[PDB]
Design a protein around this ligand. Structure first.
Ligand SMILES: Nc1nc2c(ncn2[C@@H]2O[C@H](COP(=O)(O)OP(=O)(O)O)[C@@H](O)[C@H]2O)c(=O)[nH]1
Ligand SMILES: [Mg+2]
Lengths: 163, 292
């Protein structure tokens, strides 16, 4: 089978682990602090996604550069309900996209937690992350709800097409 | 999802809850741990905070190794499994379950929804776990934090060969200054730390007055003093190496930086070993297999 390597990053509490194990198990796992990382293989549309759920590469950026050369897809998960931290997520995404070893990876943004009443839609997240100001980057944004599963397999569809 | 696959995943989640428990213990005792470590630093030697940060950076940037003996096991069959497995995948396993239960405080996780997949339920007469849901993936893979860059790895007692894992794996590990199956560890959970609390290790490692001295070695390495490691570093058990517990799976060669194959201690010939290194390395487009 063809394999695609995916680094799933983003601020804590954005919903990364819930997304990973919703794709892997179909369940909503109990909140387990991601002290280091998780990693799971998801078989979808004849593709074997290897997804790394990194808890926080903030203070350990050198430790993950080894994979950067072969990282085919970056999934940046954002809490669409967390308006106080969306610009922090913008700065983190800029730091990720400034890595020269990730220059060829495609970007998939998950605007997560759309089930919450005060969550901003995919367009507003697109504006506050500055995605339209990007150049030479193949990117796409997908509104998701990790709890129910809406939007996840659509993002997996886009990543599948970018393979 | 396959039911056995769900079993493995639930096991891994239990292991991550073990890691989160140890990390919670270390977060609770950060101040007393730092004060004890600085107490040792000022006892041995200057600016202690900077020296403590140097030692922490050395332990954090150290290579993670898993030793094996290429003369007793087929390394080809080991690599073709695509995964490294712990001892659960055997009367040794019962004492391992007791030692792990008391060392990691696994009973504090009995209320977890993943406890059925991390509990053996005792062992039957054949030294096999009674629980049909217990998963190998719930218990860690044993490694060593080879901070002195040992000649034959971090735990040469288990063989002259060793994997060097990718450094990110260290973020999923607990660390102990003594092997938890030995006498000096004493089943003391307070001697365990996480990747983000190496200070505890510095406060807990041995400072023996004869033989290999871990504390003095780490202090001298922190001061950028060039020296050769003690000949007993990583050769025995007990305090000769810093034991690491990888909570999660180790996949070959996904999680493998290098494989140091011993030329002397091997069941394959020199020609065959060079051919395997050339074949695997060319297939991976990396210098993973290193003969020495
Ligand atoms: N309402 C809502 N909550 C979510 C969603 N996804 C995740 N959460 C919650 O957010 C919290 C943190 O999620 P987590 O997976 O740990 O985020 P992570 O730290 O990035 O891995 C958990 O309590 C989840 O229940 C979502 O789509 N909607
Ligand atoms: Mg997480």
């Amino acid at each position: 089978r063809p394999e695609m390597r995916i680094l799933m990053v983003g601020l804590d509490a954005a919903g990364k682990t819930t997304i990973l194990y919703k794709l892997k198990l179909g369940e909503i796992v109990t909140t387990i602090p991601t002290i280091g990382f998780n990693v799971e293989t998801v078989e979808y549309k004849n593709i074997s996604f290897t997804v790394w759920d990194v808890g926080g590469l903030d203070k350990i950026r050198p430790l993950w550069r080894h994979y950067f050369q072969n990282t085919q897809g970056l999934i940046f998960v954002v809490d669409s309900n967390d308006r106080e931290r969306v610009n922090e997520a913008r700065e983190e995404l800029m730091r990720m996209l400034a890595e020269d070893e990730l220059r060829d990876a495609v970007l998939l943004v998950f605007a997560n937690k759309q089930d919450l009443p005060n969550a901003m839609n995919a367009a507003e997240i697109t504006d506050k992350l500055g995605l339209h100001s990007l150049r030479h980057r193949n990117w796409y944004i997908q509104a998701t709800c990790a709890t129910s599963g809406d939007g996840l397999y659509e993002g997996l569809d886009w990543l599948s097409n970018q393979l | 999802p396959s039911n056995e696959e769900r079993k493995k995943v639930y096991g891994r989640l239990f292991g991550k809850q073990v890691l989160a428990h140890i990390h919670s213990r270390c977060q609770r005792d950060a101040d007393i741990i730092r004060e004890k470590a600085l107490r040792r630093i000022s006892r041995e030697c200057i600016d202690c905070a900077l020296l403590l940060n140097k030692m922490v950076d050395i332990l954090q940037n150290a290579r993670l190794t898993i030793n094996f003996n290429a003369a007793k096991i087929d390394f080809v069959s080991l690599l073709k499994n695509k995964e490294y497995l712990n001892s659960y995948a055997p009367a040794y396993n019962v004492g391992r379950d007791s030692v792990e239960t008391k060392a990691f405080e696994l009973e504090k996780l009995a209320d977890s929804p993943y406890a059925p997949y991390g509990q053996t339920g005792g062992f039957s007469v054949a030294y096999t776990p009674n629980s049909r849901t217990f998963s190998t993936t719930s218990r860690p893979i044993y490694a060593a934090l080879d901070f002195l860059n040992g000649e034959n790895g971090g735990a040469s007692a288990y063989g002259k060969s060793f994997f060097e894992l990718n450094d990110n794996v260290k973020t999923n590990c607990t660390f102990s200054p003594f092997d938890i199956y030995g006498h000096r560890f004493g089943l003391d959970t307070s001697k365990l730390s996480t990747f983000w609390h190496m200070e505890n290790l510095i406060a807990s490692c041995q400072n023996d007055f004869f033989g290999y001295n871990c504390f003095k070695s780490l202090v001298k390495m922190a001061k950028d003093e060039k020296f050769l490691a003690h000949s007993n570093y990583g050769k025995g058990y007990e305090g000769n190496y810093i034991e690491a517990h990888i909570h999660g799976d180790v996949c070959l060669f996904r999680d493998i930086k290098h494989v140091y194959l011993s030329l002397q201690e091997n069941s394959y010939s020199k020609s065959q070993l060079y051919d395997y290194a050339k074949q695997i390395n060319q297939a991976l487009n990396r210098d993973c297999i290193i003969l020495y």
